[model samples]
Target: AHHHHHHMVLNYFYPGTKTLKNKLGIMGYKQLEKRCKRNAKKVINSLRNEPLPETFDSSYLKYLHKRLFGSAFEWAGYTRDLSFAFDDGTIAQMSMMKIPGTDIYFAHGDKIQENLKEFDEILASKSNLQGLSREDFIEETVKLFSFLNYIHPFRAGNEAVQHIFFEKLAEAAGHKLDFSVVTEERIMRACNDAMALKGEEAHQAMKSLFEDISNPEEVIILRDF
Candidate 1:
């Protein structure tokens, strides 16, 4: 079970390269892995230098996905063509994944884009956020983060992608959010619950966690410097 778990993690990032694992011209996993790491760093730095619209949509989301993993995947920024089902429905491994179907990709993508658009508009229309208390802010943003996490917009890197995204999101709302508050494991569990369980329960779990980690006033003051 341990070995299989390790293999699953590796395979999840395998660079099939749309070619034989290592035919005459293809790179082997060891080499592919190294190159992917090196090249992606360049793009990651470029992202900061590059311009991005304050308003985000599916196209913007996919563009960043593609940029971050472009060297690794041709489909990096694109909607997945297939569906996924993780976990065997076992008690311990109780899977919380069944990504949206390919047939519904466009519909969901459009909806997700609308979500990004609307969130930005709310803050811009002038919620300097003085109107909302810290509790209210966390409540609202937990829903924002959880819903985006539920959408699972990419084949890989969705969480990291959204991490960057929501930094901008929270900033626009007069706060800052980063993963430093909760452990990665906590976030993972929250995401799993968000996906498999009811939305409100998931929201409640996440909202509490956010409150525990949220440092709205202090963090905002620090962000400018």
Candidate 2:
């Protein structure tokens, strides 16, 4: 899913974007920082008071994004229309997102829905996990995470959206991942790597990241976040 691309333009408070982007000046698009926090609060409130979805499929994820960021990004609950890329030198060239471009297209986009459905089926079948050890659980866990990452489903807010979603899913499977295991920035980069790296490299990176941040022995419930 790698493709060359540029940073999104930033300047005025993008009108109709809710609080996502702020008006002109040094704040720039960095204002999404403020909006991100505020938007997250909305979901956290629901996480504490409302009953969670019964399943962890695409619709569940879609609703989470819609509630958390639908009002912010115009395409909040939809699969992103484009892929993301960066040209930070010194490091290898990398690509993310699913945008259609010059020689790029996502024939695999529809698979995202099926993959999420199948992945959720596994989590829903918690009884089958009795034979899975901590290490085994790690591998299964990363499969879902990595596959979804591969799909890059939504536009923004994908990380926390998935984090909390997985936390709830893990709860169903008798585990919990505390993504708050370290500095937010550190984990953000690590997760990006886990999502971006190749095959075994991606799995191993994700396994380590999950182990460091997860509390498998603990239980995650609707009241938890």
Candidate 3:
């Protein structure tokens, strides 16, 4: 199922409330956030023992979402597709969205795969970021993250997925992106700049932020057949 038109935004939210309808039966946004944090923490712990496959793609991102928040959201593995129905009988299609208070819109639901295809191309051209210098690594990783931010493929949790995806990429590339060290305010500003700026300006915005937060680590070697 698919929607060519945007559905009412409130369809994702509870009746007359800003809080989203969730599987945990929470109506208040703050409480839902708390539960979401707890659920994601458990998922993170599990990943420490067994990480996801090294493959990176749109489907991989959907699976990461499911693994991270499957217990809290029924739409965990699904994108903003029109298939899901809401409590008000409305279709759960995110045909249009934007960063809060930003004029720029995310990739439309109908064109998510198209946008992701470009993301795939970018990643493929980087050769899994293998053997790149730290400076080059920061530039290419920021480019990848910028595209992912523009795509914003999922209805929610896009940031978490991006962090983990880049973390894995960094690990494979002999670096570590310790996002924990960055402040929330700086992240928001950097992301917004990456989206709003153009050309070298945007790349510089994101690269500067990554330069501050990313660190060099031992590279893991994978044997080729």
Candidate 4:
């Protein structure tokens, strides 16, 4: 059994490096990433084969992270807490993190739990999104993605968890959210674009992405940014 209390300050990764401390025994950041992708793919497929509870709350979100990354990382199921100490001397606490290239900040590490609780209430009111039109579905989906992204509950694997969480949510709502057809680069751009906006308009770029990906006949044209 591993002792977590001793490693609290170090958080997810090893000291002064981008490499995450993992159960997989991988040292290099790139190698760990490659292994994580493979591990995530398997977990995603397994979850697809047998769906988990659709509570769509903070607990469910953590469970998704656990299922997706538990094989590789020891802290797979936890949120970003006061324990997070990054390689660049960044401490994850309240109001932590701007998007890498932008000024948009996600929910604070301290407020993550509260943020997700609020998110759950909003989701609960949506009634599983059943019987909605395609355009309305796209609109709502963009908002859902935006809210969850802002919450940014976990330290890593937020996007992956969001993908699968929304995938399941969409399925229940009589829609399909297939990320296979979209490029990761484009998705990141779209998310950044969405978050960069303010107030109610934040989900606009994400709306475009959802519409494109949701389109059965349209192939995505990758724009070189």
User: Best by lDDT, which number?
Assistant: 3
For candidate 1, write residues 35-80 as lDDT tens digits.
6557666876676566546555556667777777765654467554
Worst 10 residues of 3 by lDDT: 216-225
Instruction: State, as a TM-score between 0 and 1, how close model 3 is to the true structure.
Output: 0.86
- List per-prediction Cα lDDT, in the order shown: 0.56, 0.60, 0.78, 0.76
Pick out the ten consecutive residues of candidate 1 with the lowest summed lDDT: 86-95
lDDT of 1 at 177: 69
Give the CA lDDT, 0 to 100, for residue 60 in model 3.
Answer: 71
Quick one: best TM-score, which candidate? 3
Residue 185 of model 3, lDDT score = 89
lDDT of 4 by residue, 75-184 (tens): 67778754654445545432365698666788877777777877888778876666798778888888878888877877788899999888888887777888877899
Q: How close is candidate 1 to the true structure, as a TM-score?
A: 0.58
Misplaced by over 4 Å in model 4 are 1-10, 52-54, 82-95, 199-201, 216-225
TM-score of each: 0.58, 0.64, 0.86, 0.82
